[PDB]
Amino acid sequence: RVAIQEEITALNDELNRIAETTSFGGNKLLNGTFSTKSFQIGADNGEAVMLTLK
Amino acid sequence: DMRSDNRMMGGTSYVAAEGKDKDWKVQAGANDITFTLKDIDGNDQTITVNAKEG
Numbered sequence: 001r002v003a004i005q006e007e008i009t010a011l012n013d014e015l016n017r018i019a020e021t022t023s024f025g026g027n028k029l030l031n032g033t034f035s036t037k038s039f040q041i042g043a044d045n046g047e048a049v050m051l052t053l054k
Numbered sequence: 055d056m057r058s059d060n061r062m063m064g065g066t067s068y069v070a071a072e073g074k075d076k077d078w079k080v081q082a083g084a085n086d087i088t089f090t091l092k093d094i095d096g097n098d099q100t101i102t103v104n105a106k107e108g
Contacts, residue, residue: 036076052076 029053079108 019030028034030053038048057063088102 050076 080105082107 020028022028022030032054034053036050036052038050040048042048055062085105085107086102087105088100090098090100093099
């Protein structure tokens, strides 16, 4: 059980690292600092769609 | 005048003091917004927009 716990802690640290390091060119995504960003997909202003990353 | 600072090269901006977020939805009974203004010709205009709930 101690060995399984050690491996589980290693995987937990891996999960936290994945959350904290994934980015799009330097913009962190899964660490909670993306929040809601609105993407302008129209030829006119005010035609954006919100995307939220948790 | 064709300078970028000419008054005809822009207009007026009104920014809402109350900011919304992703989980905000238009509530029933508070969905209508009415703009009362004067057109360029000088005749008054009243445009009422009933925003869709949700």
